[PDB]
Symmetry: D2
Subunit: 431 residues, 4 copies
Amino acid sequence: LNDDATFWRNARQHLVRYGGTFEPMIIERAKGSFVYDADGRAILDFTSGQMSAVLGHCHPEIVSVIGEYAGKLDHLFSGMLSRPVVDLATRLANITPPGLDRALLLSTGAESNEAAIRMAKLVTGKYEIVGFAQSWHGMTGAAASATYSAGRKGVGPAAVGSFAIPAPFTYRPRFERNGAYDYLAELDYAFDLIDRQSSGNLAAFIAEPILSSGGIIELPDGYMAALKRKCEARGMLLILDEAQTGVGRTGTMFACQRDGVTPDILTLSKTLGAGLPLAAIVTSAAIEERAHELGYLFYTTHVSDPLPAAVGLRVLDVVQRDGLVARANVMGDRLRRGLLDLMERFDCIGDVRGRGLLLGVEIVKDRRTKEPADGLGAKITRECMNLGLSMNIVQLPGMGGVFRIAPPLTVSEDEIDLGLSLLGQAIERAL
Amino acid sequence: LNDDATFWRNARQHLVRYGGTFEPMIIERAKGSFVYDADGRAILDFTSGQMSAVLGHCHPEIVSVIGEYAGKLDHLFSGMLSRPVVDLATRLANITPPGLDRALLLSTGAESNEAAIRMAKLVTGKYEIVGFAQSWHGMTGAAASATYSAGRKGVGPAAVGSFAIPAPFTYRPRFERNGAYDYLAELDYAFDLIDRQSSGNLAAFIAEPILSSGGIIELPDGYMAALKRKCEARGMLLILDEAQTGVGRTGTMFACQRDGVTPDILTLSKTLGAGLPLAAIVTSAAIEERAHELGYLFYTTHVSDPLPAAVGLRVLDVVQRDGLVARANVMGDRLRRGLLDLMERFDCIGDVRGRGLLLGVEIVKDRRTKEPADGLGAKITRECMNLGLSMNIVQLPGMGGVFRIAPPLTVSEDEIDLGLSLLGQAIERAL
Amino acid sequence: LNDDATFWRNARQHLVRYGGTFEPMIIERAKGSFVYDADGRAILDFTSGQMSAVLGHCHPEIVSVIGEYAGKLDHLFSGMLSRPVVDLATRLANITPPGLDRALLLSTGAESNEAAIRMAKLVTGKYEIVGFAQSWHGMTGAAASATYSAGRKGVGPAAVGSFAIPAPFTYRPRFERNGAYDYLAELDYAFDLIDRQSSGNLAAFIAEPILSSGGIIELPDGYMAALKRKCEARGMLLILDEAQTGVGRTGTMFACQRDGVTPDILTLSKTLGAGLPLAAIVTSAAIEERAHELGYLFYTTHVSDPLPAAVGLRVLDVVQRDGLVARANVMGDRLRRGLLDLMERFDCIGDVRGRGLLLGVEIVKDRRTKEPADGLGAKITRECMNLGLSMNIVQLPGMGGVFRIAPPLTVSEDEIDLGLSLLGQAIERAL
Amino acid sequence: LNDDATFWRNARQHLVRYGGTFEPMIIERAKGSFVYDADGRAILDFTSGQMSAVLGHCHPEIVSVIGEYAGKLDHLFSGMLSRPVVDLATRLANITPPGLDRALLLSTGAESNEAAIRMAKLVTGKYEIVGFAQSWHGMTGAAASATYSAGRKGVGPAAVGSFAIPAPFTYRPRFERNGAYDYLAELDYAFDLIDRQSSGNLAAFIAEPILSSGGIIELPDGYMAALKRKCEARGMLLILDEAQTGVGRTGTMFACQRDGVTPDILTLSKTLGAGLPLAAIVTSAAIEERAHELGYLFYTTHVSDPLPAAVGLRVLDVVQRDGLVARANVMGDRLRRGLLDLMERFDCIGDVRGRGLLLGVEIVKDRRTKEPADGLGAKITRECMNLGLSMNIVQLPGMGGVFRIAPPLTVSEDEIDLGLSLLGQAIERAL
Ligand SMILES: Cc1ncc(COP(=O)(O)O)c(CNC2(C(=O)O)CC2)c1O
Ligand SMILES: Cc1ncc(COP(=O)(O)O)c(CNC2(C(=O)O)CC2)c1O
Ligand SMILES: Cc1ncc(COP(=O)(O)O)c(CNC2(C(=O)O)CC2)c1O
Ligand SMILES: Cc1ncc(COP(=O)(O)O)c(CNC2(C(=O)O)CC2)c1O
Ligand SMILES: [K+]
Ligand SMILES: [K+]
Ligand SMILES: [K+]
Ligand SMILES: [K+]
Ligand code: NA
Ligand code: NA
Ligand code: NA
Ligand code: NA
């Protein structure tokens, strides 16, 4: 039983609490789209862990690779190159759109964003960073300063030159021009204000193609193109944070491919390492060249370590070989349609959004007032788990609670059906 | 041969340069205190990789453990607990001095320092951070703002409330009271200045017990005790960064044990993961309790992931079981004495310092003027490698180039002898 | 002649240029609504100098008072009180709305705003300051950080916690809700964004009732009431900068009286000193009490000096006795109607706005496209002067050039007519 | 009587308290080196008001000049030049050392320092400002950020890039090299630390030749020369704040003349206006030229107003004509010797320092322990006033209370004797 008093005594006694609450089970094993508790109860992992288990838990190839290098080439002095590092860097260049040539292989998402923000600052000679008011880039210094969905209070001033602009949210529109929600005019309006505040040091804009932590908010048609233009006109770099959207999850290898807009710096992390700590930034030869001329520095312990890189290489290997990107579209459509049927049945579902296998379900009280359902989400979230479905809802100011659904790209048709099943029972049960 | 033109073409074409230069070899394998090149040439790893390979490369137990969990329990939603996390947290409490009770398991050193600085800020309601002018805590935002040995230029303003004080450097003394280098008076003097500048928001002091990147500078007798008092008197937390000094390297399990001063927050990383990306902060129950009351947040992708934690657990397991801490003292003494004999032979060696298996050798021109040897270090560094010895020199303003020596705690007596050998030949050859 | 080569040689050789250009005349004398050049040519001062000559130039009573104290009580140690200081402080309490009780008598407008911002920061324990993107509060540190109409570039980072929101500009509307320019919804929208960026340290909002430098932009009906509510809800003080609007210029003694909204801190300066350097802040007994408890400090050389204070006292004396406030309404109506007749004649006049004797005329090219007239303003401005009328146009991004008209409250009916005359001739001539 | 209950009721009811306490008298008149109370009691003004009454109170020539322009040329639009402005600017160029050519005429000391700091920032393209830990430059934003003797707490973060270094204080030495107080080595030591913290954006150093608020601390021989070199080597401007030292007070027209070191920007204020609000910055033609090219802006209400400028012109006129500079040396010597005789009599006088008519007397308990006399100063200060002598003591951390003595340069021999008399009686009485 998960009721181990010794276990719980120790957790309570010696663990730093870092946000949220700990689930009241002891996870003993993981395999595929499932995690198993102390009792052996299977919990369908509909969030891919912390949205990282792209190939699901303990993928046989991952296991082989890990063991493979665990005992061959593990960690090295950061000035030393090895084959998995060069092969991974080469692959990343090869699969990203034209204009992205060179990579830096790191350990975490926040770290990847910090490396990119630092590079943007060096190269422009400027320092003000612009992000979305609903963004999430990490907990570390720069990454945090650019995070507005949470964490900005009680911890001192943010980085000097921190600005946010509102993200375009079609479900809950707030800017109109002739009865219509003009998200492009809003963008213009937002930048005018920025221009007036700036000290003349705009260095970059950082963005998620789809704001996950933010509420599964997809940037609408033509927006990214418009944003890049705004950056271009001001001498700013565009940094795209694809921690959650990269590596096939949305149906394209990279979210920026769908829009056809290639950023100046691309960051990857969660999906790339497939549960392991690996991250990266990819930039153009030109930007890297200037950063170099200028003495760019981002020297860490694990930068360019062979093991994680070797892991990243195999992950891309199987995503491509198993056509997991297309898969994401087909399973996504199946999962998406199911959610819509649920929305046909329950008035508590106000919106179903997202792309590929990065979906969101926004819970409301009045499916006309679009009033956030106070506590209903937590209840639902609660019943799912009883029911054996791991979910994750996010609650932000002014919106309804949002369920973030992101199962492994390896998820089965039966597994998708299971989740839909359980979700309905959880709903009817929580109401 | 390491001369693979394809390999080198790809590195050049697709790798972001991040500091320093890449060694001109292709590392194919690693095992024990050695790394092997494309030709199979063995290079004695005298820096333990990036100072992380505590049990040396590909330790059989590490390999077992990694495989062991790679296919059992890998990555999880951050709200889910598992046994390796709780066992590791418990162990850390158990082996650290009294007053350190709760741990947060992360991925990188910089991340560990950020988590601690953030917590210190939350708990005090303040934000100014004090570090050493020769410090090194990482490349990320907060960690960088507190790093003064390098990286502060061309990348915009530092974090608001950033101050440094000079570190006590006995080799190159700069503060005197009655003909004597009074490092305590210097400390008093440094704090008076701080007091005058502060906005009344001093939150914490962050320090390395031994400044590695800084030049292998050991805080002299009674200093840490004096510093903690200075912090105590001002309502500041003391954060000790033991990324390089923790896990037995200096001869005690933790460097703070030797002085007998226990910090408010302890950070670990490099040595803890043994080449893998794992890091941690340990704090007191009281501080964690207040952080909690206050809504502390440090929620990341890999926080509390079982695999790395399981790795950390085994590392501590073998350090204790194989008495690697004592070992560090005995091999250190052997390595230390050898360096002293070299210093008997060569006038270019001005100082041999450090503790246990964290040693430094400062190169000079006039062993009386203590004038930094311009380029001699690089030459030496160069000859070592030809000779088959991986070394690392650090060059800071106003000091001589310093070799940072830190071989695995598993290093053999013969391996230590080998290194000394090669080092002398490299010296006589570079002069 | 103004052509004095010696004079011009010296100006060129020894004057620091501080913005704009120097008029090419030598002003020898001033009296009433006129300034006289080297040739004796009378220039009708339609801007009251730098918008300060409230009683016009060299008012007989001002002259008496100045002489009167120049030789009786001049300057004192700042800890010493005298009668004019106490009488002025008492008067200010007496003529401001209920809720404003205590005054601090200073020297400049920027200084007055700094004193208020500092007090707001002390009292709230917070530091982020919110202003209008088209604001003008001064050139000094804090006052500058809160100024967005200009001066933010090439001079380093602004004060930490600096935010701006768009000012409601009815002529050039930019926020709509059902075909209508909803300036209140815009206000709501602006504050939501603020909320998301803030570090939880909002201290105050600073505003001009009518943005002078900004383009003679009057806050529309119900706005100030809404803004104060926004401040109230967030624990922020409302600071009203009436440097240009105070002392009767707009038709009420203080602009805040018209709206009926009394700020937490009121600042005055330009009009108060009537050309002389005197300024003030007035706050509530409660706020002053807390500032005191907390050790408020704003100790300067001229704070509480009798001479300027004695000047300020007489200025209020004659404004009240001569009913200059009502006068402002009657002469304003006359001046206003004239401007409207001009706008009937010339398509280049797109808007006539303002209140009392604080009027603005916005120049455009297409009185339908409302396109800013490129250079026409400068031409007009140029012809006026030839014609003998001192005017002042302000050119801001996205708007047409705006003439800021503000003649002495003592201006005559004939003088108003003269100005209108000259203005038409200048127009017909510049086209 | 000063006991006017109505007066005191009003002061209490309507005055903002701004630091210190209000003297319990009502100053009715001033003339020469005296201020008179409600009862007609003469108080010898030994601080020249707030250290501004250079020609003493209500100087006949000042009175004439003020009246003279009060009714001729008063205040003007800031783009308009007049003769007193050009004559004053010309004079300043003419009497300052070679290398100072152009002036900007403002209203306050803080404003003058802000104008200079802003200009330094524009011209260097940098922003970090370095000052003395015991400095006093004003209460406004930038000026405050550079002030370390007080006011840094409870009012939010200082300006980004604010650093201080210790001022050389010979009475209380703290840095030694071979038993000797090496203030130059201290300076070197201070700059090394600065170098390590800086973000590579050092713009200027701001300093008082003699720190008044700081405790009458005179920069020792060769220091300024060394400091300018430190600035020169780093591309920093040297800003000299002579608010208290300028216009003859120290025995030379400007304090920087004695050392022979001419700063890049010179600021003046207190003494210049002789009690009235006038201030200035003087810079080199080259610096002004670059500031201009770059769009320097420091446009205020009273910049270039004829009245104050006309006042400043007459002040310089009589200082030169009456040889008040030499006078300062002769009366200073008389005042200085007297203080030394007092120090012969009382063990409570630990030090007599300063230059010309800018003197300081540091009170101690143990004239061997040099222990600050706790409360004795306030008592003395108290008895002086009873006795009819206005004094001003400053109490800073780690030093004894310091009396700041600065009587008008017009002070009489009898007046100096009177003060010495009263001071001794006050001492013997307060002990
Ligand atoms: C005391 C200390 N603290 C933190 C760090 C940063 O850890 P990461 O590089 O894993 O984030 C280092 C290492 N610094 C490097 C070095 O060896 O110089 C890797 C660069 C460290 O030594
Ligand atoms: C777009 C994006 N960028 C960076 C990160 C931070 O990565 P790390 O947590 O590994 O540093 C997240 C994750 N954020 C969390 C979430 O799922 O809410 C883990 C907290 C991310 O989504
Ligand atoms: C060197 C120096 N620089 C600037 C100033 C500020 O000038 P203002 O007070 O007129 O703005 C002072 C005065 N400071 C005070 C003092 O005598 O302590 C008036 C407070 C000054 O001494
Ligand atoms: C609302 C408001 N607040 C403060 C100030 C600054 O006052 P000072 O210039 O006397 O310090 C102005 C004036 N600004 C100027 C203008 O007319 O544009 C003089 C420049 C002001 O209008
Ligand atoms: K590495
Ligand atoms: K996790
Ligand atoms: K005063
Ligand atoms: K003026
Ligand atoms: Na590519
Ligand atoms: Na412990
Ligand atoms: Na009132
Ligand atoms: Na000169």
